[PDB]
Subunit: 152 residues, 3 copies
């Protein structure tokens, strides 16, 4: 069975007890699709995101899904942290995830999330909202199995 | 909010023709809570980058360029813009290109970027009046939100 | 008054052994003939450095258009995008995007293709997928823009 790691990228979330829906939404999607083992990290924006990515990549996790920190305000550094770890980017997948938020949420176009491969790990940046997360998972659902196989 | 319009066209800056895009952009800005500075019409290449740097250093909130985003030897607006940017916003440039479809297939050849430099938002638009209108229509729904975010005002989840 | 030349590069290591059934080359050749490209040349190279070698050669020769097929995925052997970006002066992201979108919605995995398009020297370079279907999808995207793109490159 394939392994997965969820990384909630949010200083706000990491500053207290996590009680938000996005982690569970993603974990439930993964769990119900038979990913195992399966774990969840909530980390602050900036270097802790890159640190968590590096940890999971060195551990050869099959799939990493991050949520949050993809926008254009000063604390949004998930794309930076992610690109720094990637071997290559998969632009069509990030574009598809953005497009899934249109026309309902015009500011979907401001998300700078990337997807890509690092080592033998697929990494997918999702947005921080439950709606954006669900939209992104629905995009991923039709390609994730094929993507993991092709990486292998 | 402040805005700077930059027309990138050696032929307009000469000027062998009168630019139509600048006034379109200016009216659009004025409808929407922007106070435009005097537009600049500059020749392609380094003058574009120099006008971008001047505006960023003067902390203009929004810069909109028009022209020089194609793939001819003198289309260097994307190169000049990227050189000034801190980061790009790919989804916005994409949406601006898609807005030209399916009516103008060569819209897909535009290499315009959008991004942030300092606390300034920079948007590359095409050099045609039609392309500018299509792009402004895209920008309309997101531009104030974007500027608020770049100013450091936000609500992280 | 001068016609545009086109080079077809099929990126497939297998086609060096008796894979022998490259269906895509002929499809692209026919499509190029139909759009006035001449002369035409086609070749198959293995994944990796030979692709870049083939790209570099045709760019130095001022070939007008290069279409590649294959090696644009996310497998460990898919290196066509890396090889291409190494030769490019700049990318044309809208074109690669349109080619990917042409595979939707019937082929969801189209979004995994990392092919690029761009200009090197005076040469337009277009990465297409390795499947006959993806090639046909990509060629349909090029059909109403490729000569316009070469017009612009030349001025």
């Amino acid at each position: 069975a394939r392994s997965a790691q969820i990384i909630i990228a949010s200083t706000r979330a990491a500053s207290g007890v996590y009680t938000d829906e996005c982690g569970p939404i993603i974990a439930e999607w993964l769990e119900q699709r038979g990913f195992s083992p399966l774990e969840s990290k909530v980390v602050a924006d900036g270097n802790p995101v890159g640190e968590a990515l590096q940890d999971a990549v060195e551990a050869q996790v099959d799939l990493i899904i991050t949520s949050g920190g993809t926008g254009i305000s000063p604390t949004d550094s998930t794309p930076e942290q992610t690109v720094a770890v990637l071997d290559f980017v998969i632009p069509g997948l990030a574009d598809a995830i953005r497009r899934a938020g249109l026309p309902k949420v015009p500011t979907s176009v401001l998300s700078r999330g990337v997807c890509g491969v690092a080592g033998q790990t697929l990494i997918v940046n999702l947005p921080g909202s439950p709606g954006g997360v669900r939209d992104g998972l629905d995009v991923l659902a039709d390609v994730v199995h094929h993507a993991l196989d092709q990486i292998a």
